[PDB]
Amino acid sequence: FDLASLAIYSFWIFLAGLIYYLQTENMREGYPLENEDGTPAANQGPFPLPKPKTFILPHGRGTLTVPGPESEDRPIALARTAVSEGFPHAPTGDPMKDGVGPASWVARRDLPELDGHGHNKIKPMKAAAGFHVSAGKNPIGLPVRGCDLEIAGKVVDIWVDIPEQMARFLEVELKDGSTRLLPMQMVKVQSNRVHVNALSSDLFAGIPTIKSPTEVTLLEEDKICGYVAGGLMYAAPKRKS
Amino acid sequence: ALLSFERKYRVPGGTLVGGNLFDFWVGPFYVGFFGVATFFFAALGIILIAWSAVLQGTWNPQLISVYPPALEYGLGGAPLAKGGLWQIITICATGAFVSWALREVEICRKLGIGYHIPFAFAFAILAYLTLVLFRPVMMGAWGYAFPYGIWTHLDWVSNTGYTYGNFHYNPAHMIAITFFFTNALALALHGALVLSAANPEKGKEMRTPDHEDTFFRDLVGYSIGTLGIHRLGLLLSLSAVFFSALCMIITGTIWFDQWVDWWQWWVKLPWWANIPGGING
Amino acid sequence: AEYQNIFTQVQVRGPADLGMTEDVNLANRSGVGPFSTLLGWFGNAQLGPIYLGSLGVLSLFSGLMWFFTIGIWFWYQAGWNPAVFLRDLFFFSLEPPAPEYGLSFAAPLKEGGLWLIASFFMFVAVWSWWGRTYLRAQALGMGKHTAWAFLSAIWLWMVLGFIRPILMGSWSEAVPYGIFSHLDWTNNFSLVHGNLFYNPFHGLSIAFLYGSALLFAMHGATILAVSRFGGERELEQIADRGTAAERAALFWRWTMGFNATMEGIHRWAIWMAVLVTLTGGIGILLSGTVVDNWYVWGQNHG
Numbered sequence A: 001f002d003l004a005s006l007a008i009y010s011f012w013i014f015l016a017g018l019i020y021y022l023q024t025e026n027m028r029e030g031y032p033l034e035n036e037d038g039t040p041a042a043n044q045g046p047f048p049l050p051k052p053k054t055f056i057l058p059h060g061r062g063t064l065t066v067p068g069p070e071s072e073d074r075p076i077a078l079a080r081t082a083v084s085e086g087f088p089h090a091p092t093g094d095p096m097k098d099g100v101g102p103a104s105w106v107a108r109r110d111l112p113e114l115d116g117h118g119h120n121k122i123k124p125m126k127a128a129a130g131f132h133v134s135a136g137k138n139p140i141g142l143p144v145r146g147c148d149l150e151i152a153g154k155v156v157d158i159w160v161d162i163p164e165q166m167a168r169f170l171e172v173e174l175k176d177g178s179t180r181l182l183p184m185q186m187v188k189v190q191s192n193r194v195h196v197n198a199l200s201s202d203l204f205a206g207i208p209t210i211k212s213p214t215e216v217t218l219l220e221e222d223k224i225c226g227y228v229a230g231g232l233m234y235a236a237p238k239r240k241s
Numbered sequence B: 001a002l003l004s005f006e007r008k009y010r011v012p013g014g015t016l017v018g019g020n021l022f023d024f025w026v027g028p029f030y031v032g033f034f035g036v037a038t039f040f041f042a043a044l045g046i047i048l049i050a051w052s053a054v055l056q057g058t059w060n061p062q063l064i065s066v067y068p069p070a071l072e073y074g075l076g077g078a079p080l081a082k083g084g085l086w087q088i089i090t091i092c093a094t095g096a097f098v099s100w101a102l103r104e105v106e107i108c109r110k111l112g113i114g115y116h117i118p119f120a121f122a123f124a125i126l127a128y129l130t131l132v133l134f135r136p137v138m139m140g141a142w143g144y145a146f147p148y149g150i151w152t153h154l155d156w157v158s159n160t161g162y163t164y165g166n167f168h169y170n171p172a173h174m175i176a177i178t179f180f181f182t183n184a185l186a187l188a189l190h191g192a193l194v195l196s197a198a199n200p201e202k203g204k205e206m207r208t209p210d211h212e213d214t215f216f217r218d219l220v221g222y223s224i225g226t227l228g229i230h231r232l233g234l235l236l237s238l239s240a241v242f243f244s245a246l247c248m249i250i251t252g253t254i255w256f257d258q259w260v261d262w263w264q265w266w267v268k269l270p271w272w273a274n275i276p277g278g279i280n281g
Numbered sequence C: 001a002e003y004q005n006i007f008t009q010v011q012v013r014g015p016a017d018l019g020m021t022e023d024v025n026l027a028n029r030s031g032v033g034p035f036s037t038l039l040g041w042f043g044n045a046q047l048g049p050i051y052l053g054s055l056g057v058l059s060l061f062s063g064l065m066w067f068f069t070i071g072i073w074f075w076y077q078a079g080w081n082p083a084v085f086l087r088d089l090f091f092f093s094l095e096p097p098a099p100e101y102g103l104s105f106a107a108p109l110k111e112g113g114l115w116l117i118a119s120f121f122m123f124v125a126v127w128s129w130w131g132r133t134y135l136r137a138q139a140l141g142m143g144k145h146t147a148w149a150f151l152s153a154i155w156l157w158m159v160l161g162f163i164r165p166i167l168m169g170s171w172s173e174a175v176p177y178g179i180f181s182h183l184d185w186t187n188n189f190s191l192v193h194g195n196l197f198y199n200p201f202h203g204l205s206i207a208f209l210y211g212s213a214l215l216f217a218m219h220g221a222t223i224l225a226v227s228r229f230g231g232e233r234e235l236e237q238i239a240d241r242g243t244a245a246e247r248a249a250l251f252w253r254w255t256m257g258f259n260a261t262m263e264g265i266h267r268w269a270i271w272m273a274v275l276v277t278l279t280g281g282i283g284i285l286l287s288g289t290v291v292d293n294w295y296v297w298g299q300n301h302g
């Protein structure tokens, strides 16, 4: 056998170990598998858990070690629809309020993400030095329309990402005078309004709310983004088209 | 078996067809109506490719090939041994890809995410349909489409391109290669930049989205940003497949001569055409 | 319709970002260039600043010298006639020394001594630029991933113009500088070697390039699909898993019966792409040095 035939045989062996490395490298969240009852699954599949690695998080926020002991750290309201594995799980309540399905949120650190300088990554624009709208229609002051074609509230500020300089949320004011953050990726900015297809007008009050008006925390975001996305499924009887 | 975080997302709903009938999983795999269609099509055609592996005579995979109807059958049907199998199997594969895509849509609605993935998968499906369907129909014969075989279909890439000279000269093909080359460069970078960050020098702290911006602004003097590089990747990719389908829809229809010759339009432009000097004067 | 997050609806601008400092030398960063509203619809609107140090200028000078050297010879070919120059632009070529000059530098200017000059500048440009990638990573405290990946590309380039030419015994084996000419060289190369479609590394290289498009398509779409949960902010999804990362993983588990992690998918990414040129360069380097005809080799060792 010649030189080329070695290089090619040698390669296929390299490639498999790579696939193995990659596959295991990708088991650092979500594993070991569970039965729907939360106990460890009998079948883990052919690949072993990797050895843990440890991330040092900036600004004294500690470390993360993956893979690690895993859990939701929250009550999940759902119940089996059938007597064997592999079926859907019926929500035991209001799925939006309960935070299940498309309405799901992870329980992330309840603390805002910080920029590399240790400052909040996300500010309402009003408190963001020298930040303004550079291009496109300015949404501020527009009324907000829910998918029921009713007016949910009005836009009172844009929450921006300081180091990436983009708009992450529209702060929206409801009838009672309190506000809510709407994911920027989940609204349509029109010339005469801002439209939200995911939520009906009446569902706007239900949006999870933040603690400090000047900042928002990872956990809070997840609850907000989760709830909003969930309306795509759960608001369908209120969506006209 | 479920991922540790999985159960909270497996909830009734999201289906395009049949309500709660097919709404359930087998192991990890979501099923739904289009899971079922996909199986049907994919398995039917897989049985049919197994059968052509009889009429051909061999069970070896480097060998088995299903050739299209010959150029004399035109757009009509052909006997199963004579390329009729191909037509069915082709129809089958179209059935499995489209089912697969809409299945992803169904999976999408249930997860409350956007449809971007099966939208992007559409372009692949679309490229394939160009080669096996659109281009053959514009041309008049099924036989102009590529055979299904590991090596023999490669023969058809060579045969086809060399009909037109060195195929490098198809201009849509050029734009296609430019997008692939760039995508792969952009994939390499993107992957590197997130990795260099999450896994910085030994014992240091994780870097930040700012460190990423900084690195590239340091390096090339511009950073496209973390929303942009995903926009970029998606765009570079789909553009490559778009110009691939295009480069091949125009070849054998609007342009059938040697592609290199298409370029004389520029060179015979009246202002510089007859000037002496250079290569063409 | 639903907003799909392909183009920005409202751009927003603050002060210019001068970047993170760490161990970088600030003397060698420029001031911030202007702001493109054009770019802002897709990516960031800010150009600059840029770090140009000693190794930076060496690279940036060399690469211009490589480029200018080709252009001068291109003008000569055009007979210094601007209208010809633009007409024949893809047809011009700066070719390497003929095979009789072997690996020697003694070949005349018009005979491809020019081409060796131009290559030298290119050689310097890339390798300096390579270390530039490492260096900027070092100063930020980051991984050398970018530079290790860029090596993979340098590999194919090093094989086409340099290493394979040495091994074959001449510079004439190298690639000419020109648009159509180099395209021809590519196609002529395949024929001379008995059809690279028979080269197993070539086939693999293709698989990775297609796969690169397939992967990045998947990935990019996936991040946009989950950008409603803050998906694109990947480093913090790594440090603390979000509902973005979760439904991202689960789309793919429910579809193909397995999935990735917010960190893991980038290992897939870097390797998918890197393997393209990696296998590519092996495929080329083995061609003519060892394997004469890929169809023929493939008749036995297949």
Ligand code: BCL
Residues within 6 Å of the ligand: B097, B124, B125, B126, B127, B128, B130, B131, B156, B157, B158, B160, B161, B162, B166, B167, B168, B173, B176, B177, B241, B243, B244, B245, B246, B247, B248, C186, C187
């Ligand atoms: C000598 C031959 C000619 C030549 C002749 C041709 C010809 C002929 C064609 C190309 C095409 C292409 N050529 Mg060319 N090409 C040449 C030289 C090159 C060179 C080079 C370095 O020299 C490059 C980089 C390229 C690059 C390209 C791309 C633009 C394109 C292939 C991508 C594509 O279309 O994907 C599209 C992707 C698909 C079609 C995949 C579809 C996937 C489907 C939907 C899903 C399948 C699922 C599967 C069944 C799953 C299996 C089941 C598993 C269990 C999961 N060519 C030479 C000069 N080239 C082709 C093209 O553009 O066609 C559109 C084409 O037809």
Ligand code: BCL
Residues within 6 Å of the ligand: B046, B049, B128, B131, B146, B150, B151, B153, B154, B157, C197, C202, C203, C204, C206, C207, C208, C210, C211, C214
């Ligand atoms: C797109 C332009 C040309 C084309 C040009 C080339 C060229 C040129 C080459 C290939 C090569 C390949 N092509 Mg082809 N190929 C075409 C269209 C197809 C289609 C299709 C239905 O459209 C398929 C399934 C394939 C399949 C293949 C693979 C056997 C191989 C690597 C693909 C890859 O890695 O992509 C990236 C995708 C992934 C990594 C995902 C995994 C996809 C797996 C590998 C597909 C396996 C299919 C299996 C062999 C057969 C499926 C049928 C089963 C019975 C169900 N080609 C058209 C005609 N293709 C290379 C080769 O190795 O040839 C021997 C090669 O050099």
Ligand code: BCL
Residues within 6 Å of the ligand: B157, B181, B184, C063, C125, C126, C153, C154, C156, C157, C160, C185, C186, C187, C188, C189, C190, C195, C196, C197, C201, C202, C205, C206, C207, C209, C276, C277, C279, C280, C281, C283, C284
């Ligand atoms: C007639 C045409 C021949 C053919 C001949 C060849 C030859 C010859 C080669 C390839 C190679 C490739 N071919 Mg082939 N190829 C054919 C048919 C195909 C088909 C097809 C559809 O039929 C496809 C899809 C491909 C695909 C491919 C790619 C997978 C591979 C290129 C890798 C790459 O990304 O390089 C692009 C990346 C680089 C070239 C790296 C460059 C890195 C350097 C450092 C960058 C320097 C930049 C410089 C400083 C300028 C800066 C400018 C800035 C603006 C400042 N070939 C047929 C059979 N093909 C290459 C290979 O590896 O083969 C194994 C190769 O050598």
Ligand SMILES: CC[C@H]1c2cc3[nH]c4c(c3C)C(=O)[C@H](C(=O)OC)c4c3nc(cc4[nH]c(cc(n2)[C@@H]1C)c(C(C)=O)c4C)[C@@H](C)[C@@H]3CCC(=O)OC/C=C(/C)CCC[C@@H](C)CCC[C@@H](C)CCCC(C)C
Residues within 6 Å of the ligand: B181, B182, B184, B185, B188, B189, B192, B219, B220, C059, C060, C061, C062, C063, C064, C067, C125, C126, C127, C129, C130, C133, C146, C147, C149, C150, C151, C152, C153, C154, C273, C274, C276, C277
């Ligand atoms: C291995 C997988 C892919 C890959 C990866 C890859 N490439 C890379 C990297 C990586 C990981 C880098 O880190 C590195 C980089 O820094 O890119 C941002 C790079 C790079 N790959 C590049 C290009 C490139 N990559 C290619 C391919 C690939 N790269 C593979 C597909 C190709 C192809 C397909 O052939 C090309 C052409 C560069 C962008 C960069 C390396 C640049 C370099 O070496 O710099 C040389 C320095 C110079 C100064 C060059 C001269 C510049 C002139 C041509 C300018 C012309 C205009 C000017 C005269 C006037 C302008 C005035 C205006 C006012 C108009």
Ligand SMILES: CC[C@H]1c2cc3[nH]c4c(c3C)C(=O)[C@H](C(=O)OC)c4c3nc(cc4[nH]c(cc(n2)[C@@H]1C)c(C(C)=O)c4C)[C@@H](C)[C@@H]3CCC(=O)OC/C=C(\C)CCC[C@@H](C)CCC[C@@H](C)CCCC(C)C
Residues within 6 Å of the ligand: B038, B041, B042, B045, B046, B049, B089, B092, B093, B094, B096, B097, B100, B104, B117, B118, B120, B121, B122, B123, B124, B147, B148, B149, B150, B153, B237, B238, B241, C210, C211, C213, C214, C215, C217, C218, C221, C255, C256
């Ligand atoms: C458009 C950008 C790129 C792209 C995107 C893309 N592909 C995708 C997706 C996306 C976004 C998916 O979501 C989906 C997926 O699940 O990805 C893992 C997919 C996918 N693209 C795939 C492959 C693939 N993509 C390719 C390319 C591309 N896809 C583009 C480069 C290629 C190339 C370049 O050759 C291949 C081979 C699959 C992994 C998956 C679609 C799987 C699917 O549809 O499953 C249903 C069908 C079956 C299980 C089998 C049916 C088979 C039988 C009917 C017989 C075989 C048909 C016949 C044509 C045989 C051909 C034999 C070959 C030797 C020619």
Ligand SMILES: COC(C)(C)C(=O)C/C=C(\C)CC/C=C(\C)CC/C=C(\C)CCCC/C(C)=C/CC[C@H](C)CC/C=C(\C)CCC=C(C)C
Residues within 6 Å of the ligand: C067, C068, C069, C070, C071, C072, C074, C116, C119, C120, C122, C123, C157, C158, C159, C160, C161, C162, C175, C176, C177, C178, C179, C182
């Ligand atoms: C009006 O225009 C002006 C005057 C401004 C210009 O100057 C314009 C200039 C042009 C328009 C130039 C156009 C340039 C091109 C068309 C570029 C074409 C280039 C390619 C197609 C590149 C393809 C591949 C090239 C490769 C593979 C080269 C590899 C290089 C080697 C690795 C380098 C090896 C170095 C050598 C051999 C020398 C070594 C000697 C030592 C001892 C170290």
Ligand SMILES: CCCCCCCCCCCC[N+](C)(C)[O-]
Residues within 6 Å of the ligand: A012
């Ligand atoms: C749809 C069938 C799935 C398998 C497709 C082929 C996988 C590619 C790896 C083949 C390995 C070849 N080799 C040289 C190791 O024998």
Ligand SMILES: CCCCCCCCCCCC[N+](C)(C)[O-]
Residues within 6 Å of the ligand: A013, A014, A015, A017, A018, A021
């Ligand atoms: C059967 C032996 C397999 C040898 C091949 C090893 C696969 C390479 C794994 C990549 C390693 C990634 N890493 C840890 C260096 O970053």
Ligand SMILES: CCCCCCCCCCCC[N+](C)(C)[O-]
Residues within 6 Å of the ligand: A019, A023, A044, A045, A046, A047, B028, C257, C258, C259
């Ligand atoms: C080339 C990409 C395809 C690689 C094939 C990977 C097969 C799936 C392996 C992961 C299995 C996951 N699981 C369910 C066992 O945990």
Ligand SMILES: CCCCCCCCCCCC[N+](C)(C)[O-]
Residues within 6 Å of the ligand: A136, C007, C008, C009, C038, C039, C041, C042, C043
């Ligand atoms: C990589 C740069 C690409 C720039 C693409 C330019 C298209 C921008 C989209 C314009 C539409 C913007 N708007 C607000 C009117 O919707």
Ligand SMILES: CCCCCCCCCCCC[N+](C)(C)[O-]
Residues within 6 Å of the ligand: B220, B221, B222, C030, C031, C032, C033, C034, C047, C048, C049, C050
């Ligand atoms: C790939 C795109 C590269 C764009 C490079 C833009 C950087 C220009 C920096 C100019 C510096 C401005 N100033 C004031 C110092 O002159």
Ligand SMILES: CCCCCCCCCCCC[N+](C)(C)[O-]
Residues within 6 Å of the ligand: C143, C144, C145, C148, C149, C151, C152, C155, C270, C274, C278
């Ligand atoms: C011939 C050069 C081949 C390039 C080597 C592949 C680079 C991939 C980088 C993966 C991880 C990098 N690291 C830090 C482990 O070295």
Ligand SMILES: CCCCCCCCCCCC[N+](C)(C)[O-]
Residues within 6 Å of the ligand: C200, C201, C203, C204, C207, C211, C268, C271, C272
């Ligand atoms: C990093 C992901 C790994 C995916 C590897 C894809 C393997 C496809 C097989 C290519 C066929 C090469 N061949 C048969 C010509 O030797």
Ligand SMILES: CCCCCCCCCCCC[N+](C)(C)[O-]
Residues within 6 Å of the ligand: A045, B027, B028, C256, C257, C258
């Ligand atoms: C290279 C082409 C091979 C594609 C086939 C991918 C196999 C699917 C693996 C899904 C894992 C299912 N399972 C049983 C391990 O859980």
Ligand SMILES: [Cl-]
Residues within 6 Å of the ligand: C003, C004, C005, C006, C007
């Ligand atoms: Cl959009």
Ligand SMILES: [Fe+3]
Residues within 6 Å of the ligand: B194, C219, C223, C234, C266
């Ligand atoms: Fe990413």
